[model samples]
Target: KKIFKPEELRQALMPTLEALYRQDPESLPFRQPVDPQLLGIPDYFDIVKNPMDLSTIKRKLDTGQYQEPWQYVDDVWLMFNNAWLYNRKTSRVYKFCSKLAEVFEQEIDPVMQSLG
Candidate 1:
């Protein structure tokens, strides 16, 4: 297998690797999950509606209802499904590229490493 350092991973995948880690305030990705109109798609939080509106939901909890925005869970069912799909694809590409990197790391640049 090849090996790589943290910096190398960052350099190679800085754009894609964020994993939405920096997408929202409080460092909570998906702070804005889905639009209120889109909330029912998963129908996850419908059962619990205190005030049951778009503006009240928070990322913390769902179910029952939200008389207050803070009370309502701003459940961002929101996700970069497209991005997730892309990463699934990336895992494959990484496999191939990693092979090359591994060979190079082991044979060419042995000091470096490939991810396990």
Candidate 2:
């Protein structure tokens, strides 16, 4: 288990954001002041950092009597499937990733801190 300090987490998130932006420069779900499309942005950062609500999701993933991480994984897959099936907005995918980062920060990271 590894834990990231706030700075480290934000730093780590930069590349992930860049990757998503590269996938579609014009319609990134999240935005930063500096143009992510531009190749030389040293430290891309988003002002809007809305965390996710994962209480219910995490409870199902690791309830007192059980653990079912695969359920969450499967659900994510299904989400993508539905998105593709309907040819829905790709922004939804970026939103999902943003929400997942919230889960990593709010729930998983703290738990890892204890283990570390």
Candidate 3:
């Protein structure tokens, strides 16, 4: 049985989401959805089939789009995975993803375990 109602789940997850967002303080590249046009990466959409970001995840969480906790987790992972695939290993975005991923794993894994 589910331990959390939708709103309760949102409450549980919001802090972790905010923690992840706080990691990218200066540039905050992962805060919003990527703009391919502004980035001059025309083929970005074709390459990265699924795009995700902190703001998008927060919106989905608030709107009750995530019925299960893993759905929210998956989107967060997808956000990082997309960056890993699209940007080169040497790229700043990729490095940011790596740093943030560590924070995410440390922070969210325990939350998920608690939920389980």
lDDT for each candidate structure: 0.30, 0.36, 0.87
lDDT of 3 by residue, 18-38 (tens): 888777452288888889999
Candidate with more favorable, higher lDDT: 1 or 2 = 2
* Candidate 3 residue runs with Cα over 4 Å from true position: none
Higher-TM-score candidate of 1 and 2: 2
* Root-mean-square deviation per candidate: 16.4, 14.1, 1.5
Per-residue lDDT value at 25 in model 2: 33
**What are the per-residue Cα lDDT tens digits for candidate 1 across 1-116?**
34444454434333221322332232232333333456433543353232221222322222333233222112212122222332344554224333332332333222222222
Relative to the unseen true structure, what is the C-alpha lDDT of residue 103 in candidate 3, on a scale of 0 to 100?
88
lDDT of 2 by residue, 1-111 (tens): 443444443333333333333444332332332243573423323421322122322333333211233334343333334333332346554455545444434544443
- Model 2 TM: 0.26
Candidate 2 backbone collisions, by pair: none
- Sort by TM-score, best first: 3, 2, 1
Best TM-score among the predictions, by candidate number = 3
